[PDB]
């Protein structure tokens, strides 16, 4: 139940404001900046502020803070979801989210803001559907918004019927400084870019552990997805009844399902790093990277960030394979490797200087984060089985999909 959705800037100027209820004075935004400054300088800054009886719940964008005032006990989660939908719409309409578009796209921004939410209740958020009634370059609204299917416009015709899938893996690892891994979760993400003719009803089928157990095939390699979050197109009743994944894909690239399950297997990359930090004299970086992944897979663009001293200078890198660059902006040793064959082992021996005078305040120990991205490798073992493309007109679809394995929260706690 937001009161006024506004767009701020990095200096406190309200780039654009659009009140939906009028229950909050338009001059209350002037106190948001001083309140945020007071909160950030005392450690009490929060995305949801409070100006007397008025709360300012907002998120931080690339260059603007999407603040939305409210007064009653509105659903803060609803406000956050509306802000996220607005950010996604802005990203879909404008390729960049900066001040260069707020002062230049006011003609369409006001229309989008007016159409998106009325009286504090958003009603339309489909960027592909919204692109048919509000344009920056108007006919009656499409029947898709009034119709039940509000994510697939009817009458779409293409010369071919190509659906490209993207099974992107997310390897998140939380390795403590003692050498054990605490949080090792794998978050699957099936992102497809559908290009079909008509309103096809895709019937996705994978090698799910629950599906295999129900069929009676609970003995082969089946992914044990603890959490499966389907898109709005996926029918919840069909999935709940017998694990039937039936949904009409939209036109373009979108996130169909987002799997999330834990993993009890050894890490793909083992990072044995040591720190021979002499007191104000020098330091050594005995970093060893052991690839526990399969030797048949190659991790393209391996980037193991090694946080070196913030005041380190005159650095030297004695490594084995891969370029080693020290970035003073990020204050870390960027162990960049282009191609790392599975089972490979690269050894590096860093050595940098240190000022004689000690620092005034502590600097902390940022965790070492690898940036491995191994294509054509599914760690969870989930394999797509079938995709029932059904159309009333009748056509022969050509489904396609690729598996990409990358690093998620692949951090390693330092000593």
């Amino acid at each position: 139940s937001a009161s006024a959705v506004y767009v701020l800037d990095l200096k406190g100027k309200v780039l654009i404001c659009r009140n939906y209820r009028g229950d909050v004075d338009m001059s209350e935004v002037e106190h948001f900046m001083p309140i945020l400054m007071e909160k950030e300088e005392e450690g009490m800054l929060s995305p949801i502020l409070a100006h007397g009886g008025v709360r300012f719940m907002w998120i931080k964008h690339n260059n603007l803070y999407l603040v939305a005032t409210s007064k009653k006990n509105a659903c803060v989660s609803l406000v956050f979801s509306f802000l996220y939908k607005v950010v996604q719409v802005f990203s879909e309409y404008f390729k960049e989210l900066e001040e260069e578009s707020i002062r230049d796209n006011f003609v369409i921004i006001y229309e989008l803001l007016d159409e998106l939410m009325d009286f504090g209740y958003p009603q339309t958020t489909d960027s592909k559907i919204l692109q048919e009634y509000i344009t920056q370059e108007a006919p009656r609204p499409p029947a898709t918004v009034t119709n039940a299917v509000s994510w697939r416009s009817e009458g779409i015709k293409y010369r071919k019927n190509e659906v490209f899938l993207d099974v992107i893996e997310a390897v998140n690892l939380l390795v403590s400084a003692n050498g054990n891994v605490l949080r090792s979760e794998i978050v699957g993400s099936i992102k497809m870019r559908v290009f079909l003719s008509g309103m096809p009803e895709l019937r996705l089928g994978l090698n799910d552990k629950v599906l295999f157990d129900n069929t009676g095939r609970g003995k082969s390699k089946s992914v044990e997805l603890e959490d499966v979050k389907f898109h709005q197109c996926v029918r919840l009743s069909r999935f709940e009844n017998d694990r039937t994944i039936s949904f009409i894909p939209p036109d373009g690239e979108f996130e169909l399902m987002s799997y999330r399950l834990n993993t009890h297997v050894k890490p793909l990359i083992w990072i044995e790093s040591v720190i021979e930090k002499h007191s104000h004299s020098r330091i050594e970086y005995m970093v060893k990277a052991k690839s526990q992944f399969k030797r048949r897979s190659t991790a393209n663009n391996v980037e193991i960030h090694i946080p070196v001293p913030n005041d380190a200078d005159s650095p030297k890198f004695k490594t084995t394979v891969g370029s080693v660059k020290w970035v003073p902006e990020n204050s870390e040793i960027v162990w960049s490797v282009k191609s790392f064959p599975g089972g490979k082992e690269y050894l590096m021996r860093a050595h940098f200087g240190l000022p004689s005078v000690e620092a005034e305040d502590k600097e902390g120990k940022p965790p070492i984060s690898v940036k491995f991205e191994i294509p054509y490798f599914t760690t969870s073992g989930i394999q797509v089985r079938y995709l029932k493309i059904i159309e009333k007109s009748g056509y022969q679809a050509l489904p396609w999909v690729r598996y990409i394995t990358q690093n998620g929260d692949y951090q390693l706690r330092t000593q």
Binding site: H278, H280, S281, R282, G353, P355, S356
Partner: protein
């Protein structure tokens, strides 16, 4: 890449080198530095700070950084440990009560993991009184042979006259440069 310019410079000499000058107060360090730079015995008050100069001899720029031996300046020797290649020890054999303190200071300064490439250079200063020992009694008392991975060399230099300074400089040059 080509380094022909480096060879051309080396045809007339390119290496300069550096040097350090530490030790206890009233050890004749300032007078010795002045004689090395100028060639005269200059009268100087105790070094509250330090003295930094250079010496041009044998085509090598002998940069000397004099360091005092004040109690409040004893722990300040770590400031010159950064980007330092040489080290010279100036003992005071005329102070028996301060000999133990000088040895302890040298040992503490020799117990650093940053100064490893700096060879030892023991200079026997105040070589004008009969109470001064030889070039071996001081070394035996300090146990200079017990310095593992340390190239030490004791040299007796007379502050009033200046004998032995040239031999010490030649030894330092031979220890620094390993060519003809």
């Amino acid at each position: 890449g080509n380094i022909f310019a480096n060879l051309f410079k080396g045809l007339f000499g390119k290496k300069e080198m550096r040097i350090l000058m530490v030790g206890l107060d009233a050890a004749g360090k300032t007078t010795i530095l002045y004689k090395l730079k100028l060639g005269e015995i200059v009268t100087t008050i105790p070094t509250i700070g330090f003295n930094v100069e250079t010496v041009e001899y044998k085509n090598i720029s002998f940069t000397v950084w004099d360091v005092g031996g004040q109690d409040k300046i004893r722990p300040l020797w770590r400031h010159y440990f950064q980007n330092t290649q040489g080290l010279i020890f100036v003992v005071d054999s005329n102070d028996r009560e301060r000999v133990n303190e000088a040895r302890e200071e040298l040992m503490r300064m020799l117990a650093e993991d940053e100064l490893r490439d700096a060879v030892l250079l023991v200079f026997a200063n105040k070589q004008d009184l009969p109470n001064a020992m030889n070039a071996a009694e001081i070394t035996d008392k300090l146990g200079l042979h017990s310095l593992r991975h340390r190239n030490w060399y004791i040299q007796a230099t007379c502050a009033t006259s200046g004998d032995g300074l040239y031999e010490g400089l030649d030894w330092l040059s031979n220890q620094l440069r390993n060519q003809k």
